């Protein structure tokens, strides 16, 4: 096919006839062998600064017509009724879509489901972004992204699996957290719901423990979502211990010379059961006692020594008075 002067159609708008030509595995004077032309088309396309490439032959003249990928003129956000146009700009930016660079109409789908994925990223779980171009003059294009935003979803039903001691519902009874949110405080992304869901899950435990069940684990908090992305389906997977009776408390560590007191603030009536809060209510009592004698930051941590054989727990509390400060 022995090539001579090979022209370039006019594809070339923002590409240098010189960068372009450099990119062509067929120097002029080679002997272009059809497979070759296809290598060239692959090559040209590799550069990735255009949508379409053509390499046609002639009187020993390669014609290389090209459709330069278009240049982003404007990114217009319409319908984003709850995300600052700037956050979206930031996001497209991140994805790789700046207000200036190329375009590649291939990835239009992607672009959407990237925003569509950023709307999951907040809470509009189900939400559709329509991508829509607009040929502009100087081989520019204008980019309207239209957001039919999203009905935000809501924890519609707490379940609880693993419970037997207490009814699937005297546990739930006191939860603060409903399928809605009050005087718009600062949920942002359901941070209230989280806060609240946590507090509730704290109450679930504090119940069992307060009742003798050391070893009560919240093995997992199985959250799901409706098939119709409707609302959320929290589920708490319990594993409720046996009960356990107290078998003594043993305050160890630096008791600051009030093991006298401190320890006498730690009695039982041995036919007593374990009880989380009763414990916490003791720690504090210490922390104050110490605190009082000038110990602003005494540390106190209690750890149950659960004896399974005789279904009983020994409470190994440890106290390290602070840094008696002094002025």
Give one DSSP letter per residue of 179-234, joined into a string. Answer: SB--S--S-TTTHHHHHHHHHHHHHHHHHHHHTT-TT-EEEE---EE-TTS-SEE-
77 vs 8: CA distance, rounded Å: 37
266 vs 285: CA distance, rounded Å: 10
Which helix (H) or strand (E) segment holds residue 141: the answer is strand 140-148
Spatial CA neighbour of 75 closest among 48, 125, 47, 115? 115
Q: What is the CATH number of domain 1-69?
A: 3.10.20.310
Q: Which fold is adopted by the domain 244-327?
A: Ubiquitin-like (UB roll) (3.10.20)
306 vs 247: CA distance, rounded Å: 10
Q: What is the resolution of this structure in A?
A: 3.3
Place of tokens 């239009």: 108
CB atoms within 10 A of CB 70: 23
CATH superfamily of domain region 70-152: membrane protein fhac (3.10.20.310)
SS3 for 235? strand
First to last CA, the chain: 98
Q: How far, in whole angstroms, is CA 123 from its chain's centroid? A: 11
For residues 163 and 198, the answer to whether their CB atoms sit within 8 Å is: no
246 vs 313: CA distance, rounded Å: 5
Which helix (H) or strand (E) segment holds residue 114: the answer is helix 108-120
Contacts of 236 (CB under 8 A, 6+ apart): 158, 159, 160, 161, 162, 201, 204, 218, 220, 221, 222
Place of tokens 């067929």: 26
Residues of the chain within CATH 3.10.20.310 domain(s) are 1-69, 70-152, 153-243, 244-327
Q: Which fold is adopted by the domain 153-243?
A: Ubiquitin-like (UB roll) (3.10.20)
């Amino acid at each position: 096919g022995f090539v001579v002067k090979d022209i370039h159609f006019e594809g070339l708008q923002r590409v240098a006839v010189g960068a372009a030509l450099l990119s062509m595995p067929v120097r002029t004077g080679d002997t272009v062998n059809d497979e070759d032309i296809s290598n060239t088309i692959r090559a040209l396309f590799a550069t990735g600064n255009f949508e379409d490439v053509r390499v046609l032959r002639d009187g020993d003249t390669l014609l290389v017509q090209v459709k330069e990928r278009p240049t982003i003129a404007s990114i217009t956000f319409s319908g984003n009724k709850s995300v600052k146009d700037d956050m979206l700009k930031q996001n497209l930016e991140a994805s790789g879509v700046r207000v200036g660079e190329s375009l590649d109409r291939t990835t239009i789908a992607d672009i959407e489901k990237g925003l569509e994925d950023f709307y999951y990223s907040v809470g509009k779980y189900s939400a559709s972004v329509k991508a829509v171009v607009t040929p502009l003059p100087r081989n520019r294009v204008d980019l309207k992204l239209v957001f039919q935003e999203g009905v935000s979803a809501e924890i519609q039903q707490i379940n609880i699996v693993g419970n037997h001691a207490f009814t699937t519902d005297e546990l739930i009874s006191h939860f603060q957290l409903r399928d809605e949110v009050p005087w718009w405080n600062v949920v942002g992304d359901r941070k209230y719901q989280k806060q609240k869901l946590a507090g509730d899950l704290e109450t679930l435990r504090s119940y069992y423990l307060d009742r003798g069940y050391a070893r009560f684990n919240i093995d997992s908090t199985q959250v799901s979502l409706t098939p119709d992305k409707k609302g959320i389906y929290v589920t708490v997977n319990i594993t409720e211990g046996d009960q356990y009776k107290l078998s003594g408390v043993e305050v160890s560590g630096n008791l600051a010379g009030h093991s006298a007191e401190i320890e006498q603030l730690t009695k039982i009536e041995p036919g007593e059961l374990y009880n989380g809060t009763k414990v916490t209510k003791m720690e504090d009592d210490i922390k104050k006692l110490l605190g009082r004698y000038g110990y602003a930051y005494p540390r106190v941590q209690s750890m149950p020594e659960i004896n399974d054989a005789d279904k009983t727990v020994k409470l190994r509390v440890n106290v390290d008075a602070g840094n008696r400060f002094y002025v």
